[PDB]
């Protein structure tokens, strides 16, 4: 679980751009306010290498 990848983002990534910011993704209408829930997901998901 030491490796993570970005799953959710508002827009596409420009070439050679690093996006290290970590804010809860807004996939719905109500704001997440730092709480993961319905239509509110953590963007970084961990690889499950086995």
């Amino acid at each position: 679980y030491n490796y993570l990848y970005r799953l959710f983002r508002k827009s596409n990534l420009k070439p050679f751009e690093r996006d290290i910011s970590t804010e809860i993704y807004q996939a719905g209408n109500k704001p997440c306010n730092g709480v993961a829930g319905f239509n509110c997901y953590f963007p970084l998901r961990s690889y499950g290498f086995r």
Binding site: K14, E17, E23
Partner: protein, 105 residues
């Protein structure tokens, strides 16, 4: 000096360029910003100052993760003449820049 960034609130990386008549200091890491100086960090650059009636023109652009800076100091309001600008630097910053501000004394 100048500051560039998206939100400029220590949530995303923000370019900072400072002149002090001795050298140019350029960094990319993030901090909270409030106006001008008085009296986690990835890229650092130290160079020669961009300093010296006299008109100083600069061009900043962000192409493919490269921050390109061109400049020209000329002796002379913008006059009717024509003067080209020579490239100073092409830094590999690689950040998302949408807003900027200037830094006075």
């Amino acid at each position: 000096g100048w500051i560039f960034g998206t939100t400029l609130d220590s949530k995303t990386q923000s370019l900072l360029i400072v002149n002090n008549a001795t050298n140019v200091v350029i960094k990319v890491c993030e901090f909270q910003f409030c106006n001008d100086p008085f009296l986690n960090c990835t890229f650092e650059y130290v160079s020669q100052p961009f300093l010296m009636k006299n008109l100083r023109e600069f061009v900043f652009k962000n192409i493919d993760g490269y921050f390109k800076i061109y400049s020209k100091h000329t002796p002379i309001d913008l006059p009717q003449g024509f003067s080209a600008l020579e490239p100073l630097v092409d830094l590999p910053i690689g950040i998302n820049i949408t807003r900027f501000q200037t830094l006075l004394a």
